[PDB]
Design a protein around this motif. Structure first.
Motif, PDB file in Angstrom:
ATOM      1  N   UNK A   1     -72.014 -87.859 -29.891  1.00  0.00           N
ATOM      2  CA  UNK A   1     -70.661 -87.026 -28.915  1.00  0.00           C
ATOM      3  C   UNK A   1     -71.192 -85.476 -29.142  1.00  0.00           C
ATOM      4  N   UNK A   2     -72.224 -85.277 -28.423  1.00  0.00           N
ATOM      5  CA  UNK A   2     -72.429 -84.299 -27.947  1.00  0.00           C
ATOM      6  C   UNK A   2     -71.795 -82.959 -27.122  1.00  0.00           C
ATOM      7  N   UNK A   3     -71.302 -82.515 -26.539  1.00  0.00           N
ATOM      8  CA  UNK A   3     -70.755 -81.744 -25.568  1.00  0.00           C
ATOM      9  C   UNK A   3     -71.806 -80.529 -24.111  1.00  0.00           C
ATOM     10  N   UNK A   4     -73.244 -80.638 -25.136  1.00  0.00           N
ATOM     11  CA  UNK A   4     -73.868 -79.157 -24.039  1.00  0.00           C
ATOM     12  C   UNK A   4     -74.561 -79.993 -23.104  1.00  0.00           C
ATOM     13  N   UNK A   5     -75.645 -78.873 -22.377  1.00  0.00           N
ATOM     14  CA  UNK A   5     -75.328 -80.016 -21.344  1.00  0.00           C
ATOM     15  C   UNK A   5     -75.978 -81.152 -20.827  1.00  0.00           C
TER      16      UNK A   5
ATOM     17  N   UNK B   1     -72.377 -77.180  -9.087  1.00  0.00           N
ATOM     18  CA  UNK B   1     -73.401 -76.585  -8.990  1.00  0.00           C
ATOM     19  C   UNK B   1     -73.762 -76.335 -10.373  1.00  0.00           C
ATOM     20  N   UNK B   2     -73.972 -77.958 -10.852  1.00  0.00           N
ATOM     21  CA  UNK B   2     -74.553 -77.803 -12.614  1.00  0.00           C
ATOM     22  C   UNK B   2     -73.696 -77.579 -13.333  1.00  0.00           C
ATOM     23  N   UNK B   3     -71.874 -77.663 -13.019  1.00  0.00           N
ATOM     24  CA  UNK B   3     -71.176 -76.719 -13.923  1.00  0.00           C
ATOM     25  C   UNK B   3     -71.571 -78.094 -15.033  1.00  0.00           C
ATOM     26  N   UNK B   4     -71.524 -80.006 -14.853  1.00  0.00           N
ATOM     27  CA  UNK B   4     -71.574 -80.382 -15.140  1.00  0.00           C
ATOM     28  C   UNK B   4     -72.307 -81.422 -14.500  1.00  0.00           C
ATOM     29  N   UNK B   5     -72.504 -82.583 -14.648  1.00  0.00           N
ATOM     30  CA  UNK B   5     -73.381 -83.768 -14.835  1.00  0.00           C
ATOM     31  C   UNK B   5     -73.190 -85.008 -14.346  1.00  0.00           C
ATOM     32  N   UNK B   6     -72.697 -86.336 -13.658  1.00  0.00           N
ATOM     33  CA  UNK B   6     -72.546 -87.398 -13.957  1.00  0.00           C
ATOM     34  C   UNK B   6     -73.542 -87.796 -13.362  1.00  0.00           C
ATOM     35  N   UNK B   7     -73.406 -89.475 -13.219  1.00  0.00           N
ATOM     36  CA  UNK B   7     -74.023 -90.103 -12.750  1.00  0.00           C
ATOM     37  C   UNK B   7     -73.307 -91.249 -10.915  1.00  0.00           C
ATOM     38  N   UNK B   8     -73.654 -91.609 -10.342  1.00  0.00           N
ATOM     39  CA  UNK B   8     -73.419 -92.282  -9.220  1.00  0.00           C
ATOM     40  C   UNK B   8     -74.506 -93.759  -9.624  1.00  0.00           C
TER      41      UNK B   8
END
Length: 192
Positions: free
Chosen positions: A37-41, A122-129
């Motif tokens: 459960x990391x919450x960094x990058x 702008x890379x505030x957060x990453x998700x996948x599709x």
């Protein structure tokens, strides 16, 4: 050893809407890819979600002190797309509609079975599709959620998106995913 085809089969037999599907798959993948459960990058989780959906295997994402092995330089061919305007929300747009609209853009520009890395603001957060052929599944396997804009609270499908919200859809190439697959770094990440 984790069989992603069979998770999708099982999931797609359920009378669940698309957002709930994404949310289920993502919670399942979160336990495997982000057990700490990391919450960094979040870029490494999102990449590991991509790798999983492409059939390369489910592995634990790099923790912060493994970032310097590979992820540190991962996006160097994409820095301009990441900084660009991307897809901007409309005023009064609900989460569900902005999602649908992102999804349509991706479905039009990607082929079935493909994946994209999605930069939030702008890379505030990453998700996948993941393009399954008929729809896009959005997966946040760091936090165990489907489509989101990295709000500090959960958002329902009928919530309004704040003005000028955006996503940048990053088309990581098959070469880039394969390169990662053939790296020492990927190979030392714990299978499952």
């Amino acid at each position: 050893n984790v069989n992603v085809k069979k998770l999708l089969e099982s999931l797609n037999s359920k009378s669940l809407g698309d957002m709930d599907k994404d949310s289920e798959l993502a919670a399942t993948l979160q336990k495997m890819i982000n057990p700490s459960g990391g919450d960094g990058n979040s870029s490494g989780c999102a990449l590991h979600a991509c790798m999983a959906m492409l059939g390369y295997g489910v592995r634990e994402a790099p923790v912060p002190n493994e970032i310097s092995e590979y992820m540190t330089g991962f996006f160097h061919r994409h820095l301009e797309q990441i900084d660009s305007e991307g897809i901007v929300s409309h005023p009064n747009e609900t989460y569900s509609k902005f999602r649908e609209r992102i999804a349509e853009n991706i479905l039009q520009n990607t082929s079935k079975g493909s994946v994209v890395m999605i930069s939030i603001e702008q890379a505030t957060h990453w998700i996948a599709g993941f393009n399954d052929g008929e729809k896009i599944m959005f997966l946040d396997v760091q936090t165990g959620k489907g489509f989101n804009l990295y709000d500090p609270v959960e958002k329902s499908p009928d919530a309004f998106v704040d003005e000028n919200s955006s996503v940048q859809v990053i088309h990581v190439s098959d070469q880039e995913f394969d390169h990662y697959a053939n790296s020492s770094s990927w190979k030392s990440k714990r299978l499952c």
